Amino acid sequence: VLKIAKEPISMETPIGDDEDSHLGDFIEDTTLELPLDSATTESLRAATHDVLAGLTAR
Amino acid sequence: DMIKGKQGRFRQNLLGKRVDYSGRSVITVGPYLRLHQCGLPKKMALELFKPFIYGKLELRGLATTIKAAKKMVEREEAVVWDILDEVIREHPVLLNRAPTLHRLGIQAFEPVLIEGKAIQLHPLVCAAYNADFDGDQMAVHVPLTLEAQLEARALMMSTNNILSPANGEPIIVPSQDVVLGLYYMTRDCVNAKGEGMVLTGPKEAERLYRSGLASLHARVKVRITEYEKDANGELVAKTSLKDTTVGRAILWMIVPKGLPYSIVNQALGKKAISKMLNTCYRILGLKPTVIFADQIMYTGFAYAARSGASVGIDDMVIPEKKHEIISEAEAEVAEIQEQFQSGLVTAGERYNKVIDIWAAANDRVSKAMMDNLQTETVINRDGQEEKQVSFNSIYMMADSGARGSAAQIRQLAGMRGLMAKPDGSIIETPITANFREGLNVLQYFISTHGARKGLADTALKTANSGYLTRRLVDVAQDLVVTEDDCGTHEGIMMTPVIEGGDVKEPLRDRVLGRVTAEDVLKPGTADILVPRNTLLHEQWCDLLEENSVDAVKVRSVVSCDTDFGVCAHCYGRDLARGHIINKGEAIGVIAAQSIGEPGTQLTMAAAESSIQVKNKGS
Amino acid sequence: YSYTEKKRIRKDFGKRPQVLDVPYLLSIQLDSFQKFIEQDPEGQYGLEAAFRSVFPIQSYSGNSELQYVSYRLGEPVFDVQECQIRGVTYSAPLRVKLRLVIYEREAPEGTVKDIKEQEVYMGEIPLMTDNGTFVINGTERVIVSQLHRSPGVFFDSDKGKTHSSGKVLYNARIIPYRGSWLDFEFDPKDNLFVRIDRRRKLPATIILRALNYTTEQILDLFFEKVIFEIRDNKLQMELVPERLRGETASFDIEANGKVYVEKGRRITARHIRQLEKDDVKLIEVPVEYIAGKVVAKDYIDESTGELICAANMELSLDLLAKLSQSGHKRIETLFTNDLDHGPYISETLRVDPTNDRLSALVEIYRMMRPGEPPTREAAESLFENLFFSEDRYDLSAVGRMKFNRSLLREEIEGSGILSKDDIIDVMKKLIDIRNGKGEVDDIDHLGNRRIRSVGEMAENQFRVGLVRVERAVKERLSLGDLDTLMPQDMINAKPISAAVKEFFGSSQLSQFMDQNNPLSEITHKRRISALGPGGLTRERAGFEVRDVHPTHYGRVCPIETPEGPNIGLINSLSVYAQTNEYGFLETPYRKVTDGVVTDEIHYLSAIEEGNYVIAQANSNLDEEGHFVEDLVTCRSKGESSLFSRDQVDYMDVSTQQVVSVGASLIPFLEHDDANRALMGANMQRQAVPTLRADKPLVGTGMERAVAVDSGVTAVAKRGGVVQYVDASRIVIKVNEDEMYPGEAGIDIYNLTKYTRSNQNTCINQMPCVSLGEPVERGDVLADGPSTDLGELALGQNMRVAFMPWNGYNFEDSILVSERVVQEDRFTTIHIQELACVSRDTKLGPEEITADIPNVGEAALSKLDESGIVYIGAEVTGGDILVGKVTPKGETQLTPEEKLLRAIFGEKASDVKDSSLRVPNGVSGTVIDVQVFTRDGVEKDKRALEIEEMQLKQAKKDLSEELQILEAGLFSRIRAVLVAGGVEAEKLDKLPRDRWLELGLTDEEKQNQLEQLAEQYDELKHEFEKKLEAKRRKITQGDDLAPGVLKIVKVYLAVKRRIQPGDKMAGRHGNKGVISKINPIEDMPYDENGTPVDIVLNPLGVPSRMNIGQILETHLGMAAKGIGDKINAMLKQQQEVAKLREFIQRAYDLGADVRQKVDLSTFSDEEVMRLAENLRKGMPIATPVFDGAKEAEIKELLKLGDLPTSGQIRLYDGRTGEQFERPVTVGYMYMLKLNHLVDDKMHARSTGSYSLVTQQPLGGKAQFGGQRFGEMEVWALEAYGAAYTLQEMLTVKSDDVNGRTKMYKNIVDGNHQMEPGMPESFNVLLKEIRSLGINIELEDE
RNA sequence: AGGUA
């Protein structure tokens, strides 16, 4: 409840007491898949397709 | 508020359009590097090129997946390092200064792997970056796609940008240490080992110097083969004896074939070396110019190190008349103050007279100091003493123009003279001491005002220059060369400029690189020496100088009939080449940068009574 | 004479002996907070002032008043050390005595009942440390003193903007200490206007109308009456012969019955003197002269009361006839001279639309608040509270004293609220200045700018807190019971404490202490800021304030300020300057009697300085204060000039008083350019502490003072004999004459070792003393960071040669020998902090464990069974320190992932790895582990181990103290027991704890034995209670923010060595970056063979004007030559006599040196101690402007058997061939700045993107890319750079799809791009559409 | 916030 009682803060507030940079300028996007993982997924898809091609038809 | 921003739109351009595949680090000198390359630390190279490393590792099959390649590169095994060398070998990288004032603020270089953590920058290029190695940080960008790699190699490359975009004279000019080395190597003494010798080739000169059988500078007759570009562009080998010095012959060894020997047979300051590079580029081309610039850098550094040029405490010799001049000027200002109490002279006139007296005293002190330092050497040639250029080191850096001008040395060895107080008024009593005779408390407190004013002026002028160059870029944004030629006989009447009473900018410099708008006749006979509208290179300027025509009509961009752009001719030639501008070049942006970048350098009787012509003419 | 000085005597130059020892450099902060917190028996600065100002609080109906008695500071629950360890503030509870009094209900006042609340807790105030700092969140913060315009009246000149009229104007601003500003300004129409704050100007007479003044009253108070007697024809007037100045004869000037000056003539001083000597009483004047005059007051008929004249109209024939026929005889007109009091107030009254108090109040109420129908009561309340409410308007003592000073009153005190007389005086002064009689006052004179130190700012903020809690109390006194209720239940500590914490923690003037040097700390605590709340915003320049004013001399260091866009705003306070009683800057001056310069001092303020003439510190005095020049250089009115030696009134106390500590520490500052000296002083604060911090050879004498006065050095509070030496503890047996009555025992100094500073630099203290050394008060027991032998030792002294070397030192670059890294010098220790928080998420509480799913066993190796790395384990980038794991939520699987899990038989893990890895790029040893688990949450093994460690440490300390004390107790027990019958045979062989079992016959000895047995029991109880009290602190957990179950802090110590890329500099301002570390052989070497450690570009000297570095280099040769000679003597070990003679000659060598000579030291031990301390060179002290001359340096060089010119020919390392002409070599003090290249790299190809935009940036482990701003876009556009520009814009910046496709293509080995669209532009389109604006993309 | 160019 004590955690809930506090209100969210703006990103427009400066981080570090009036540095010309804002808080939101540092927030990392966690909903974006890393290109490393995307390349891994592409390679895995290619490998699985090749392996399935290595098996029989049915 | 999210749309409206400064400077410009935030997310789009500034602030700030962050970019991937980039690094940043402190820069150091790269005195072994070639001009077309720069030192890049191994760690930054590895981190920057991780996708390339993965690609090549999977290509040669040392890793079966991207994840395995990632494990290999984070383990930093010796295997990935050869891959890294391979990917770096041809890939050029862009080096960027923290502030970018003109297009030379970003230049391509071939990265060279170095153990360490700082980017090694070519010493010749730091002048363009306006970067001094005092903690300046530069950024590195990686042009990814093949088109971008090629684009960087063709345009971004340092060797392709040896000339400033604001003026044809080279921007990669030897600056301070190399200039000092060249000057010491070419400056002649009055007596030294091995004078009067006869030598064939500069190779014997280098042999004699390195063996210690002669001195670096000594009057010697040497047989040298100078090559002259003549006839149709063919080398003319002329072998004869020149009276020169050993250091000059050693330098001539470096100079590529095709230049007159007279260019090096002289004391070489900053101006001399810059002119020599300009002549080399105009006569030979690009590749000889780059090779010669690199070789002259190496030679200058080597012979500066061998020079042992050092600034001591004795190489600011105080002029002997400093006390006498100071005491005299004190006497006259005391007399003027006494007369002011008598009411004979007004306060303003008294102040002006005191200021003039102190200015005269300062000039006398500076002249005496310069006479003392300039010809300090009095050594005899064979027994007869003679007055010639001093071996004094501070006089070498003053004369060669490496660092420190006459005004600079004036505050060191003479007296630093008048300055100003708040309200910007010149102080009645100047500083009678210099930095070799330590300033007392009060005079230092006085100098503090000048220091504060200078620093605040630099800050405010930098901000104002940034705003100005932004506005220039805005107005000149959309302008681009869209046509090779439009066809127009309009233009501007072009003359050497004379403001006041004397010419300060001749016709040739203002017309060099311009296109003719009218076939101007000779000042005498009505003969056309300049054909229909054509680019004016150095040969045409020389022809115009020989037959001195008062005015030339020149196709200006303003009179160009092209719409949605300008024709190539109406612009000129200036870029990084002596050839006409290429269609598609954005002249607006280069012009805006050219006018904006020097903005940080901007910190600002017989007249109307009787006209006195200084020379004899009609 | 200090034994610390005995251990190393720095050779001090300087021909003028100082008469005033360097003040305690932190006196400003300490005195400020002492004034803030100490009790005051009267109304004085601090909490007492705020309380007495706000209390008593009167209830809005109820007769229930709250009265203040006193305040008491509770002892802090945690000391400084545990406050830093636990991350909690170091603060003292504030408890206040209050009484609620209820009077007669309801009748006239008079107490009926009263109740007292004792020591009510209304918040905790941060308590000041002994180093002059505050600990707030485990970080040591500093409150920078603020320079702000003093309360009072400023009569400023308005220039540069003239309302298209010229004639620059004047304006008087009344600036209150608290309240609303007042402005009286002029217009180019010679009218006066009043502005409350900065609202619309009103005609100036309105304020007087609101002050209940009639027009005639105003005219009487401002203008001078002129008497006109109605006699003869058309009146005569009573002429004062002194009144006529600068007037033309428009009226016959008669005297003694005849006219002297006829009409039309020019009146000069001759006619004026004739009139004065003739004493003209009255003159007949023509009516034409009358017609331009103005009547002062009203005039009605004397027989019928008909109004015929009123106040302030021009005179005319008809009005004169009416007043003559009415019966008047005396007419009082206004004296209006264009050089004397001009037509300002008259025309202002003409402009005035109001004529009464009510309309003035209406106008004021409407200008202050637009519209707002002017209720009479509301307007009256507004006017009264604007300037006459003590709780809404206050000038304070400083404001009142300045107010009376500018109006030239002998009073220096009075009511804070303004009075009508004060306002009228301000108007009169402003009008006189407009007439040219008065003079304007600068807003840059240090007399007009006051310094608010920490105490005053804290008191003001506490006053604001008291104001808001006063609002709460006044609401409660009517909302709550109007009868007896306990007052602790109606006082709210939350607002006051919260606001105080906001001030101390998050403010423009509360900064992390720049803690990488003792000098840095001293400068930060001495810093003076023109910014902050109530000061100047950075929207300035505004050259005036940034510029150095002539009053700064000796008060503010002129040559120390940042070069950023705050230059001349962040100053540093001078060495000798101190804050005046009223908050202004005062500097000491030696009082000068006409003939003799006395040694007594007076601290002169800024305004007082201008009155007298002050002699320069460079004046040469022989004997008892006698000048050697008849005309000596001095400064009287801000202008330097020669004055005869019989008019001087004061002299500068020392030659170093015109600079700050940072500037004063630079040697040969007199030989350096002010710009480059400024740069050097700024950089000197950025020096990183060095592992081998030896000393500067060429010092200035402030090294010892800076080291001692800063808190980093452990200084012996009470002298005695060193009883115990340890790297962590120093125990001193205090001298007999310095111990308190009874058993005071020992003094223990725990040495702070390897603790993280605010710059992530190690700060440790090493013991510089040994067993049995006699020490006295003020001695340096332990040398802190960048400090050795009590001297400030930021950088290191190194052999440097000024020469170009193959261009490696090209711009300002430094070339460094491999010997430097081999000697492990300039090798710094960086202690960085890492925090792993185990939180409580809604997916499940996080936990710390050794077993991490799907990780290598190497990671598990370095952790204990508790999941925490062992203390002392070596870790590198990427290694796991804390085994945090987070309860994994629902998992989505791609078809390929499902196929693979079906194949391998594996399934998704229920918990995801969240372990804290070391950020890549850093290494080092885990030196300390802190575990914080909040109370009520189960402890883990590692926390128990750490608590046991600290518990046993405290137990060991207590046991040592107790055993020493009880050993003394048992010794005196034996002494008592042996007396009164010999009992020393058996007792001596018995254990000391069995010495209380021996009885004795009834006597004073027996009573003493019983008392000492009781003392032993009391000591046992004291030990037990101390152990219990500290065990309560140790055992209890830390109450963290809600959500975090545990916190694990790990300290990484990186022994970061010097390498190419690191920024290195000198004290004089010479800068640079180390280019390449060459092998030791490549260094140029002298004839003896010593290779030079550092090579500097000499071309940086003659253009930076900093010749002082050359003199420092030469003096370094001199010092190191003396050191080499003494080292050769020590290796030869000649004798005590030879070494003593050589050292005495070295100290003697100079001219009029104040060094003082030996023998005053010990014969043998001290001589060898000095020799061993000087074998590395004799440190030399060069005062800032009383420094050594070239002749003295050359003499000292001759003593060192070194070339007089200071240049030695060096043989190259590569070729072994000597350079032509000698080269300058010498030992220069060089500094490694906190700009290490290791911190300066960041490089990325993939990583942190952003939410709203896709610009890559973020992360303290791997940062974003480099901002390709509009400048670089222009640079690319300048070339034909198109594809590279597109890469800069879309592929690598913001096009997420294009970015992924590029990464895949590069991995696959293909080089081409999708142009796509940057996500930033799509954001722009959507955001424009968010307005009422359509924007679209249209095809052709 | 401080510092760097």
PDB file of N, CA, C and O in Angstrom, chain C residues 952-974:
ATOM      1  N   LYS C 952      32.180  -8.384  16.087  1.00  0.00           N
ATOM      2  CA  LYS C 952      33.447  -8.730  16.714  1.00  0.00           C
ATOM      3  C   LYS C 952      34.470  -7.613  16.572  1.00  0.00           C
ATOM      4  O   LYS C 952      35.319  -7.448  17.450  1.00  0.00           O
ATOM      5  N   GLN C 953      34.407  -6.833  15.493  1.00  0.00           N
ATOM      6  CA  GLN C 953      35.288  -5.672  15.385  1.00  0.00           C
ATOM      7  C   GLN C 953      35.006  -4.669  16.498  1.00  0.00           C
ATOM      8  O   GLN C 953      35.925  -4.209  17.194  1.00  0.00           O
ATOM      9  N   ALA C 954      33.731  -4.326  16.686  1.00  0.00           N
ATOM     10  CA  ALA C 954      33.361  -3.403  17.755  1.00  0.00           C
ATOM     11  C   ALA C 954      33.710  -3.986  19.117  1.00  0.00           C
ATOM     12  O   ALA C 954      34.154  -3.268  20.022  1.00  0.00           O
ATOM     13  N   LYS C 955      33.513  -5.295  19.279  1.00  0.00           N
ATOM     14  CA  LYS C 955      33.842  -5.967  20.529  1.00  0.00           C
ATOM     15  C   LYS C 955      35.334  -5.883  20.817  1.00  0.00           C
ATOM     16  O   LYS C 955      35.747  -5.649  21.955  1.00  0.00           O
ATOM     17  N   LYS C 956      36.160  -6.080  19.789  1.00  0.00           N
ATOM     18  CA  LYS C 956      37.604  -5.972  19.958  1.00  0.00           C
ATOM     19  C   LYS C 956      38.006  -4.561  20.356  1.00  0.00           C
ATOM     20  O   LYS C 956      38.842  -4.370  21.248  1.00  0.00           O
ATOM     21  N   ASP C 957      37.417  -3.556  19.705  1.00  0.00           N
ATOM     22  CA  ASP C 957      37.735  -2.173  20.053  1.00  0.00           C
ATOM     23  C   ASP C 957      37.361  -1.876  21.502  1.00  0.00           C
ATOM     24  O   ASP C 957      38.166  -1.325  22.273  1.00  0.00           O
ATOM     25  N   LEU C 958      36.143  -2.261  21.893  1.00  0.00           N
ATOM     26  CA  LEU C 958      35.693  -2.039  23.261  1.00  0.00           C
ATOM     27  C   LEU C 958      36.570  -2.782  24.255  1.00  0.00           C
ATOM     28  O   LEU C 958      36.887  -2.253  25.323  1.00  0.00           O
ATOM     29  N   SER C 959      36.952  -4.017  23.931  1.00  0.00           N
ATOM     30  CA  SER C 959      37.764  -4.810  24.845  1.00  0.00           C
ATOM     31  C   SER C 959      39.141  -4.192  25.025  1.00  0.00           C
ATOM     32  O   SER C 959      39.678  -4.171  26.134  1.00  0.00           O
ATOM     33  N   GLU C 960      39.735  -3.687  23.941  1.00  0.00           N
ATOM     34  CA  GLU C 960      41.025  -3.014  24.059  1.00  0.00           C
ATOM     35  C   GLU C 960      40.919  -1.794  24.966  1.00  0.00           C
ATOM     36  O   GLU C 960      41.731  -1.607  25.885  1.00  0.00           O
ATOM     37  N   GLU C 961      39.905  -0.959  24.728  1.00  0.00           N
ATOM     38  CA  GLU C 961      39.734   0.232  25.555  1.00  0.00           C
ATOM     39  C   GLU C 961      39.518  -0.147  27.017  1.00  0.00           C
ATOM     40  O   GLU C 961      40.142   0.419  27.926  1.00  0.00           O
ATOM     41  N   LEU C 962      38.651  -1.133  27.251  1.00  0.00           N
ATOM     42  CA  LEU C 962      38.326  -1.548  28.608  1.00  0.00           C
ATOM     43  C   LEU C 962      39.535  -2.149  29.306  1.00  0.00           C
ATOM     44  O   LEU C 962      39.739  -1.930  30.501  1.00  0.00           O
ATOM     45  N   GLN C 963      40.342  -2.929  28.583  1.00  0.00           N
ATOM     46  CA  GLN C 963      41.483  -3.562  29.227  1.00  0.00           C
ATOM     47  C   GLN C 963      42.559  -2.544  29.566  1.00  0.00           C
ATOM     48  O   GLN C 963      43.176  -2.645  30.628  1.00  0.00           O
ATOM     49  N   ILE C 964      42.773  -1.538  28.713  1.00  0.00           N
ATOM     50  CA  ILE C 964      43.696  -0.468  29.093  1.00  0.00           C
ATOM     51  C   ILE C 964      43.184   0.267  30.328  1.00  0.00           C
ATOM     52  O   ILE C 964      43.932   0.500  31.294  1.00  0.00           O
ATOM     53  N   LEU C 965      41.898   0.631  30.327  1.00  0.00           N
ATOM     54  CA  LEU C 965      41.342   1.372  31.452  1.00  0.00           C
ATOM     55  C   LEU C 965      41.388   0.560  32.742  1.00  0.00           C
ATOM     56  O   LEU C 965      41.742   1.092  33.801  1.00  0.00           O
ATOM     57  N   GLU C 966      41.067  -0.732  32.670  1.00  0.00           N
ATOM     58  CA  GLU C 966      41.057  -1.568  33.864  1.00  0.00           C
ATOM     59  C   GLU C 966      42.470  -1.917  34.309  1.00  0.00           C
ATOM     60  O   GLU C 966      42.700  -2.170  35.493  1.00  0.00           O
ATOM     61  N   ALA C 967      43.432  -1.933  33.384  1.00  0.00           N
ATOM     62  CA  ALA C 967      44.824  -2.079  33.789  1.00  0.00           C
ATOM     63  C   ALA C 967      45.277  -0.873  34.597  1.00  0.00           C
ATOM     64  O   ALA C 967      45.937  -1.021  35.632  1.00  0.00           O
ATOM     65  N   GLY C 968      44.915   0.331  34.147  1.00  0.00           N
ATOM     66  CA  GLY C 968      45.182   1.509  34.960  1.00  0.00           C
ATOM     67  C   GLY C 968      44.484   1.446  36.306  1.00  0.00           C
ATOM     68  O   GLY C 968      45.063   1.796  37.345  1.00  0.00           O
ATOM     69  N   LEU C 969      43.232   0.983  36.308  1.00  0.00           N
ATOM     70  CA  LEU C 969      42.476   0.859  37.549  1.00  0.00           C
ATOM     71  C   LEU C 969      43.146  -0.114  38.512  1.00  0.00           C
ATOM     72  O   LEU C 969      43.254   0.160  39.710  1.00  0.00           O
ATOM     73  N   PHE C 970      43.608  -1.259  38.006  1.00  0.00           N
ATOM     74  CA  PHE C 970      44.258  -2.243  38.865  1.00  0.00           C
ATOM     75  C   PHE C 970      45.614  -1.750  39.347  1.00  0.00           C
ATOM     76  O   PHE C 970      46.033  -2.065  40.467  1.00  0.00           O
ATOM     77  N   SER C 971      46.324  -0.983  38.516  1.00  0.00           N
ATOM     78  CA  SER C 971      47.583  -0.403  38.969  1.00  0.00           C
ATOM     79  C   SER C 971      47.353   0.551  40.134  1.00  0.00           C
ATOM     80  O   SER C 971      48.068   0.495  41.144  1.00  0.00           O
ATOM     81  N   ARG C 972      46.343   1.418  40.028  1.00  0.00           N
ATOM     82  CA  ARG C 972      46.075   2.315  41.149  1.00  0.00           C
ATOM     83  C   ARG C 972      45.482   1.562  42.338  1.00  0.00           C
ATOM     84  O   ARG C 972      45.685   1.969  43.489  1.00  0.00           O
ATOM     85  N   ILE C 973      44.784   0.452  42.088  1.00  0.00           N
ATOM     86  CA  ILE C 973      44.315  -0.404  43.175  1.00  0.00           C
ATOM     87  C   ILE C 973      45.490  -0.983  43.945  1.00  0.00           C
ATOM     88  O   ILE C 973      45.485  -0.998  45.180  1.00  0.00           O
ATOM     89  N   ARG C 974      46.508  -1.473  43.236  1.00  0.00           N
ATOM     90  CA  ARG C 974      47.712  -1.959  43.901  1.00  0.00           C
ATOM     91  C   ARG C 974      48.410  -0.837  44.655  1.00  0.00           C
ATOM     92  O   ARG C 974      48.874  -1.036  45.784  1.00  0.00           O
TER      93      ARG C 974
END
